[PDB]
Design a protein around this ligand. Structure first.
Ligand SMILES: NC(=O)c1ccc[n+]([C@@H]2O[C@H](COP(=O)([O-])OP(=O)(O)OC[C@H]3O[C@@H](n4cnc5c(N)ncnc54)[C@H](OP(=O)(O)O)[C@@H]3O)[C@@H](O)[C@H]2O)c1
Length: 1301
């Protein structure tokens, strides 16, 4: 109604600096931006200029975020009430800001900061100051992305109390930079969204005037932060008591792609290898069931074919005959139907062969049968494509192994693929989404072809060609030297003349190209039923390799011999065993010049000179010349070294061979110049040859499914948390830090109260409405007592289990008590009487402890007093009635429906209908007022809100007490809590459980007395298992029926004092660090070193020894370490390099002095990026110290006592240069690969090891087409990396799934 403000976010608009304010990518209008709009509006109403008006905004509520849009116009309406000052910044019909704006002519500013002239941060060292780069690195790590316009704090002290704030004449920027001082005063990791600014005073009269026009250098105004009063004051501005709400950090990019950098054999993989077919025992049964169903179905087909309408009948007799050689229809369908309809967990994704076979046989034998059935099976063709038998060889691992192995060997930038016959047997639907969509460095061009248009390929980035696939000699001549890979899925089995087809197919292969063939090789009579009805000319000439089975099938052994006969080298061969087989072939390579071999075994790089010389003469030699970098040791970086060399010398000549001594079989290869094994390798001319586990293979990064990141495994200690805040359907069970004996969150205020705690094995956990309110996002974790801020979880307080002595106990503990083990203070533990089962005990503690607090501790109930209890059917309501009845009180209670009234009356026989009202209307006020003869109710236990809260205070007597325990308080109510106007009694039982002082021990004794006197009786309850935790929370939230919801953790033993059996629970991973052990962080005084150290501090670590070449040299390092120490962490910063045994000894002398060594981290990096041929040894061994010398001096020291037994984690950070390669970083690649080989040796010896292989990290742009990850997401995958069995995990984010060219 009042001023309408238009914000022009255009190319040259003066208010374009407002797009330089983003939170996790999204552009936002600053929270202190509606203050200026309200400020400018009030001055406009008064008719005065806004910079001559001194305003004061009080209790400014931020309800929404005004999302700015580039090149767009945002119109917001500001409405100010003339006399009272109530203002409203509202975009459209949605409120963005509310509060009260008041102008004045006197002095409004409280602090005297506007009088301060200079900057007190003068003459200080550079290690005692924070600069704009360091200040806004801390904000970026929390999601606050400020552009150059909003980077106002130009310098600050380590405490951030004193700052230099820039004045540029823009008031939205200046107010934001004065709120950044408050944000800079609350170090942490989460993103805090302001929600209430109690006071904001702007006095431009004492503020410096706008800088002259065209100013380039602006003045810095001193700023100060007052912790006593919580005032951020700079210049003529003052922000007081800003309240923020935790915000879930959203991911700017798409989820990272996690892979397992593992070794994969080429030919005939064993069942334990990753290139092997994924045939489970269940699949081998489905294959047999289909085989029996197919075999007998043909028998049924032959005998019933009395009309002779079954062409290929001789073929169906031959197929039936062979099945008999290698061997009722009702039973055959019975076995399959039992397999299909069973849901025993072991369940194939789908049963397509059975489904499509059933259509093949069940179809009647009559006129127009074959034409109709051929149409029917062409309508369910998808079943054959997507079938466990057919998908065993189309698994993501094999598809990626083939597609990337072929890419490592194609020496172009685009990789031309050609899938001939894409209508019958398709491969694009598997190659594209599983392997080719992950490509970042190489481009791919896919070309499907067939007789007709490929209907299913319309949605894929492929090119559809047209010609006859089933007939050679008509292949278009435009396909000569056309494709670097040829895929013939189910094509060579349809060719009448194989030699002619293969000869004509081999011409389409570029020199050095590959041919991929997938054909049936075993149990050839299983799929024949469908190749009988859905094939026209089932006749194919045989040859020297034998006679085609039926007329369209060769056996796997005959397939391999046939390919070998045409001079094809078997690069890879993966037999499914149950059905299909896969061959990858390329033509033999005959060198014209002798290959050059250089041994790169030495880790001191005594060959840098020779390789550099031979690498220089690459582009002046014959095209058939090759450099073979050979390593015969487990530790060698030849694999990642040759990837980086390929980036500047091409893939044409650079080849490599590694032989792993440790796992090389009894017959190790003998690669040495004119050897026998080498020549077999100079003929395949594969870039990377690795002999490990007894077979030649290659290192490939196998993608990890997003479902495996939340895979649940047995865990002795678990606790319930949420995967996503505010979602009650995301509740899971995570690993509990109690496996270390202690509980996360021992920092700050939790370090002051040294409560004596008894470790109890939880058997039942009661679900209260306090947990549902937190779980569903109605209230953030920050409203809870400050002692719970760093706790792993905040769900659950009450429980009933067994203490360490085996006694049955029940009690309330600080969260998480929705767990399997707790550390309950001895002053909060009651003993279960020997008449209650532990199930009944789980319902008593909180319900009655709250009831006594509300009635006898806060309400001061006296004998005979009148009490009004809202929601009498709730557990707290039932407890309140029982406590009140014991005090001989006149009870009035609000019951929703008649079922609740009946339940309460039966539960408490003293309750008559006169004692009951309805929670559906405020008609209880007249009834209660009349029934009390105008005296009112002495105590009101209020849960209902709005007009029921008002109508219930109105019933209070002269001395009556109002106990409001509802959770969903209004905004005005919360401000009353903040302003100390009213006490917040809804998280007081949680606060008394942190202090456990005089006020609690009064409630402990009141409840204990009630148990003895019989007042405290167990309530009716519903027991939910540990897997229905989500459903239990939903049951509590809905409040459809009265009762206590109690999660059953363990089964109570028949005895009464007996040790709890040790058991495991399925739970998601959650890495935790032992607080009594010392964790060494070599290079932990850096970007990821210090931000990872903070992550460990939250997850349990309390003893850090951080190592650097120089120690603390900046004010960001000194401010972080002063934050760990304040939290209660024993930090130690050593200015040494662990490059000699003396240095290694010192770092572990200091570690063992602090405590047993429980973790070693190596984040150290040194980089000299340069061209390989302009690098001497002194410059090639630069990155090799932090990665080859500090990793075997930390690995030698971790393999000796006492480190070996105590050590839990051995993390050696790596880079994707070992998996992708990079330009100029050929020395870093060698160091990063030898580091990964030391970590794989540790796994061989059973020692703990983790090797993160990160691409790029944002907070601590697009390189090789990969977006840098946000650190809050690097620590999310890092946590999964530590709690996993693989050694090397590759984490990288893709800008977008790769398309063609
Ligand atoms: N953040 C990224 O962009 C990114 C991307 C991919 C991978 N990574 C991985 O993460 C690490 C790099 O993280 P970052 O550079 O952001 O932070 P950082 O690892 O903490 O930084 C490297 C640190 O190494 C220390 N250092 C070097 N040589 C040392 C020696 N001989 N002894 C002890 N300390 C030594 C340096 O301490 P001084 O400075 O005091 O000498 C420096 O602070 C590497 O392991 C890398 O593989 C990071």
């Amino acid at each position: 109604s009042d001023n309408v403000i238009d914000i022009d976010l255009s190319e040259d608009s003066p208010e374009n600096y407002l797009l330089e304010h983003a939170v996790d990518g999204r552009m936002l209008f600053p929270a202190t931006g509606t203050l200026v709009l309200a400020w400018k509006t009030l001055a406009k109403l008064k008719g005065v200029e806004f910079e001559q008006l001194g305003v004061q905004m009080t209790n400014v509520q931020i309800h929404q975020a005004l999302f700015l849009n580039p090149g767009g116009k945002t119109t917001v309406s500001v409405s100010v009430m003339p006399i009272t000052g109530e203002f409203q910044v509202r975009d459209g019909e949605s409120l963005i800001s509310s509060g009260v704006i008041t102008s004045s002519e006197g002095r409004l500013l409280e602090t005297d900061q506007h009088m301060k002239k200079g900057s007190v941060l003068d003459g200080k060292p550079d290690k005692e100051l924070l600069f704009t780069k360091e200040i806004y690195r801390e904000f970026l790590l929390r999601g606050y992305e400020y552009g150059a316009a909003f980077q106002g704090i130009q310098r600050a002290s380590l405490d951030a109390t004193d700052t230099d704030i820039r004045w540029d004449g823009r008031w939205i920027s200046y107010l934001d930079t004065v709120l950044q001082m408050y944000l800079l005063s609350k170090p942490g990791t989460h993103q805090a969204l302001p929600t209430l600014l109690e006071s904001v005073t702007i006095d431009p009269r004492v503020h410096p005037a706008q800088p002259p026009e065209g100013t380039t250098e602006f003045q810095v105004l001193p700023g100060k932060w007052d912790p006593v009063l919580q005032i951020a004051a700079a210049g003529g501005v003052e922000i007081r008591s800003c309240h923020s709400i935790r915000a879930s950090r959203r991911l700017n990019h798409d989820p990272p792609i996690l892979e397992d950098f593992a070794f994969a054999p080429y030919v005939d993989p064993r069942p334990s290898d990753r290139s092997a077919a994924a045939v489970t025992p269940a699949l081998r049964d489905y294959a047999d069931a289909c085989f029996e169903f197919s075999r007998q179905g043909m028998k049924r087909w032959l005998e019933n074919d009395k009309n002779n309408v079954l062409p290929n009948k001789e073929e169906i007799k031959e197929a039936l005959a062979m099945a008999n050689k290698h061997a009722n229809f009702a039973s055959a369908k019975a076995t399959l139907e039992a397999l299909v309809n069973n849901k025993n967990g072991h369940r194939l994704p789908n049963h397509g062969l059975f489904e499509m076979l059933d259509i093949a046989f069940s179809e009647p034998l009559e006129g127009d049968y074959w034409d109709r059935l051929r149409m029917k099976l062409h309508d369910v063709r998808t079943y054959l494509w997507d079938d466990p038998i057919i998908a065993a060889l189309e698994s993501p691992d094999i598809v990626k192994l083939v597609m990337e192995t072929v890419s490592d060997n194609v020496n172009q930038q685009v990789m031309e693929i050609l899938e001939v016959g894409a209508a019958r047997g398709p491969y694009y639907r598997q190659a594209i989404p599983k392997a080719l969509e992950y490509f970042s460095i190489k481009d791919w061009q896919y070309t499907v072809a067939d007789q007709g248009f490929v209907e299913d390929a319309a949605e894929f980035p492929v090119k559809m060609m047209q010609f006859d696939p089933l007939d050679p000699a008509n292949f278009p001549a435009e396909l000569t030297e056309s494709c670097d890979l040829l895929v013939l899925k189910w094509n060579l089995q349809m060719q009448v003349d194989l030699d002619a087809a293969i000869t004509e197919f081999s011409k389409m292969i570029k020199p050095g190209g590959f041919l991929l063939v997938l054909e049936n090789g075993t149990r050839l009579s299983t799929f024949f039923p469908i190749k009988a009805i859905v094939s026209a000319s089932l006749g194919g000439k045989g040859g020297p390799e034998g006679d085609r089975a039926m007329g369209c099938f060769y056996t796997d052994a005959q397939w391999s011999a046939l390919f070998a006969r045409h001079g094809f080298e078997q690069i890879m061969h993966i037999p499914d065993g149950i059905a299909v087989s896969m061959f990858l072939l390329r033509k033999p390579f005959e060198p014209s010049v002798a290959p050059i071999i250089i041994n790169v075994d030495d880790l001191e790089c005594s060959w840098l000179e020779e390789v550099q010389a031979r690498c220089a003469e690459l582009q002046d030699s014959h095209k058939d010349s090759r450099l073979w970098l050979v390593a015969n040791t487990e530790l060698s970086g030849v694999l990642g070294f040759l990837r980086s060399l390929v980036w500047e010398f091409g893939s044409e000549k650079l080849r490599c061979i590694q032989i792993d001594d440790a796992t090389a079989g009894p017959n190790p290869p003998k690669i040495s110049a004119d050897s026998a094994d080498f020549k077999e390798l100079v003929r395949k001319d594969l870039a990377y040859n690795v002999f490990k586990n007894g077979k030649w293979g290659t290192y490939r990064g196998f993608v990890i499914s997003d479902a495996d990141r939340q895979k649940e495994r047995p865990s002795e200690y678990v606790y319930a948390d949420w995967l996503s805040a505010g979602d009650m359907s995301s509740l899971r069970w995570f690993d509990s830090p109690l496996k270390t004996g202690h509980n996360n969150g021992m920092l700050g205020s939790k370090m002051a109260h040294k409560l004596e705690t008894e470790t109890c094995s939880v058997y039942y956990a009661g679900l209260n409405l306090r947990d549902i309110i937190l779980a569903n996002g109605t209230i953030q974790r920050d409203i809870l007592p400050e002692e719970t801020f760093f706790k792993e979880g905040v769900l659950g307080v009450e429980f009933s289990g067994r203490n360490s002595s085996g006694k049955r106990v029940m009690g309330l503990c600080p969260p998480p008590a929705l767990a399997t083990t707790v550390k309950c203070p001895v002053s909060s533990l009651w003993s279960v009487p020997d008449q209650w089962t532990l199930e009944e005990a789980a319902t008593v503690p909180l319900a009655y402890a709250t009831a006594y607090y509300c009635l006898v501790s806060e309400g001061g109930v006296q004998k005979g007093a009148t009490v009004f209890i809202h929601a009498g059917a709730s557990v707290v309501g039932q407890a309140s009635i029982a406590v009140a009845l014991s005090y001989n009180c006149e009870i009035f209670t609000l019951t929703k429906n008649s079922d609740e009234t009946a339940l309460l009356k039966s539960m408490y026989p003293q309750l008559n209908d006169r004692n009951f009202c309805s929670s559906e209307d405020c008609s209880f006020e007249k009834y209660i007022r009349k029934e009390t003869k105008g005296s009112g109710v002495d105590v009101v236990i209020n849960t209902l809100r709005g007009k029921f809260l008002k109508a219930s205070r109105r019933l209070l007597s002269k001395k009556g007490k109002f106990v409001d325990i509802g959770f969903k308080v209004d905004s005005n109510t919360q401000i009353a809590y903040y302003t100390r106007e009213h006490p917040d009694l809804r998280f007081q039982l949680d606060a008394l459980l942190e202090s456990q002082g005089p006020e609690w021990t009064r409630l402990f004794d009141l409840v204990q007395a009630g148990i003895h006197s019989g007042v405290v009786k167990p309530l009716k309850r519903a027991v939910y298992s540990m897997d229905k935790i989500v459903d239990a929370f939903k049951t509590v939230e809905a409040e459809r029926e009265a009762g206590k919801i109690v999660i059953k953790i363990r089964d109570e033993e028949r005895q009464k004092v007996c040790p709890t059996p040790r058991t495991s629970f399925p739970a998601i991973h959650r890495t935790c660090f032992h607080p009594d052990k010392s964790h060494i962080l070599v290079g932990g005084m850096g970007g990821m070193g210090l931000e990872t150290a903070h992550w460990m501090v939250l997850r349990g670590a309390k003893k850090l020894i951080l190592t650097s070449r120089y120690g603390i040299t900046t004010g960001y390092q000194a401010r972080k370490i002063a934050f760990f120490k304040q939290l209660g962490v024993e930090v130690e910063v050593l200015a040494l390099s662990v490059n000699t045994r003396k240095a290694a000894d010192k770092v572990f002398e200091h570690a063992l002095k602090m405590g047993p060594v429980g973790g070693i981290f190596n984040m150290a990096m040194v980089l000299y990026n340069d061209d390989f041929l302009k690098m001497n040894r002194e410059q090639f061994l630069k990155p090799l110290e932090s990665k080859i010398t500090m990793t075997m001096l930390l690995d030698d020291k971790s393999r000796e006592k006492p480190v070996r037994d105590t050590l839990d984690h051995f993390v050696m950070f790596s880079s994707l240069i070992v998996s992708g390669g990079h330009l100029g970083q050929a020395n870093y690649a060698f160091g990063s690969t030898v580091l990964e080989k030391i970590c794989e040796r540790r796994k061989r010896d059973g020692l703990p090891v983790t090797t993160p292989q990160w691409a790029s990290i944002a907070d601590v742009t697009i390189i090789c087409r990969k977006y840098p990850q946000r650190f809050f997401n690097v620590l999310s995958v890092f946590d999964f990396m530590m709690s996993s069995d693989n050694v090397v995990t590759i984490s990288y984010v893709l800008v977008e799934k790769s398309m063609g060219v």
